[PDB]
Amino acid sequence: MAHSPPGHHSVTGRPSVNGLALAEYVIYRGEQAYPEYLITYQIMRPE
Amino acid sequence: SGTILIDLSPDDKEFQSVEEEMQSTVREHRDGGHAGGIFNRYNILKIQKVCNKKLWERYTHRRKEVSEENHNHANERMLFHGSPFVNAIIHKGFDERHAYIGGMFGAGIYFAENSSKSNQYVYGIGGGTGCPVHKDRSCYICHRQLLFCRVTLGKSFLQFS
Ligand SMILES: CC(C)(C)c1ccc(-c2nc3c(N(O)O)cccc3c(=O)[nH]2)cc1
Ligand SMILES: [Zn+2]
C-alpha cells in the first residue's frame, strides 16, 4: 500500500475529458472507510 | 467477526434514500459496457446495514485524527466500492489487500460517486471474466453486490485528468 501525498489524507480524481463523469477518490488507510450498506442487485437490460 | 447484516424493508426511508443514490448515479462509460455491462438502471434485490462495533470504533477513531488535522473537518462522504472481496471487507474491514496497485491515483482503496463505475470492479479489474457462472461481464441474471461506504477524505489532493 502506498502513502497519501504529504500533508493530505486522500486523493480526488477529477474527471476532465468526460463531462458526465463524477469524481473518484482514493484513501491509503483502510480505517478511513466503513462499509455501511451492502446492496444486492442486478443490472437491467435496456428496453 | 462481530458483523451482523440487518435487512432493510423497501418501505424504510433509509432503503429508499440509498436506492435513489444507487440509481441516480448511473452513467454511460467510455468502454461501451465492456467491463460492467450495458444498463441504464438496476433492479435492487436487497439492501442490508453492516454492524460491527470494532470496525466502527476503528473508523470513528481515525476520523477524529483526520478531523483534528484539518480544522475539525473530516470531509466525510458516502461513496460506492465494488470489489470481488466484499465478503472479506464487511467482516474484516478494509486493508491493503483491497487496494488497486495499478490504480491511476496510486496503490490504494478506490471509491466512486458513480455507482456504475464501482460496478465495473464487482467481478475484478475491468470486469475480469464476468460473472462466475456465465463468464458474462454484462450478465442480467446473476446477482451482484456493491458497498455504499462512509469515507473520510480529510484534505484531499486534487489530481486533474
Ligand atoms: C485489486 C482488487 C482488490 C481486485 C480491486 C478492488 C476494487 C477496485 C475498485 N476500483 C475503483 C476505481 N478505480 O480503481 O479506478 C474507481 C472507482 C471505484 C472503484 C471501486 O469501487 N473499486 C479495484 C481493484
Ligand atoms: Zn451470470
Per domain, the residue ranges of chain A are: 1-47
The strand order across the sheet containing B42-51 reads B4-7, B42-51, A33-43, B144-152, B76-81, B109-112, A24-27, A10-14, B156-160
* Whether B138 contacts B66, CB under 8 Å: no
* Whether B80 contacts A32, CB under 8 Å: no
Which residues in chain B are contacts of A46 at CB distance < 8 A?
Answer: 38-40
* Whether B100 contacts B107, CB under 8 Å: yes
- What is the fold of A1-47? YefM-like fold (6.20.320)
* Whether A11 contacts B123, CB under 8 Å: no
* Whether A35 contacts B112, CB under 8 Å: no
* Whether B147 contacts A39, CB under 8 Å: yes
Question: CA nearest A26: which of B117, B60, B161, B103?
Answer: B103
B53/chain A closest Cα distance in angstroms: 11
Which residue in this structure is represented by grid cell 465494488? Answer: B82
- By three-state DSSP, how is residue B6 classified? strand
Q: How far apart are CA A41 and CA B14, in angstroms?
A: 16
B134 among annotated binding-site residues: yes
Amino acid at A16: S
Q: How far apart are CA A43 and CA B139, in angstroms?
A: 7
Domains assigned to chain B = 6-152 (3.90.228.10)
Query: Would you list which residues of chain A are within 8 Å, Cβ to Cβ, of chain B?
Result: 1-2, 4-5, 7-18, 20-46
**Solving technique:** X-ray
Residue B85 Cα: closest atom of ligand 1: 3
Question: CA nearest B89: which of A26, A13, A37, A23?
Answer: A37
Number of alpha carbons in the 13 Å side-chain half-sphere of residue A16: 6
Q: How far apart are CA B98 and CA B86, in angstroms?
A: 9
Q: How far apart are CA B153 and CA A15, in angstroms?
A: 18
* Whether B35 contacts B128, CB under 8 Å: no
Question: CA nearest B25: which of B146, B153, B127?
Answer: B146
Number of H helices and E strands in chain B, helices first, is 4, 6
For residue B61, what is the enclosing H or E element? helix B53-68
Q: How far apart are CA B58 and CA B72, in angstroms?
A: 18
b/e for A18-33, b at 16 or more Cβ within 10 A? Answer: eeebbbbbbbbbbbbb
Q: Which three cell numbers stand for residue B16?
A: 429508499
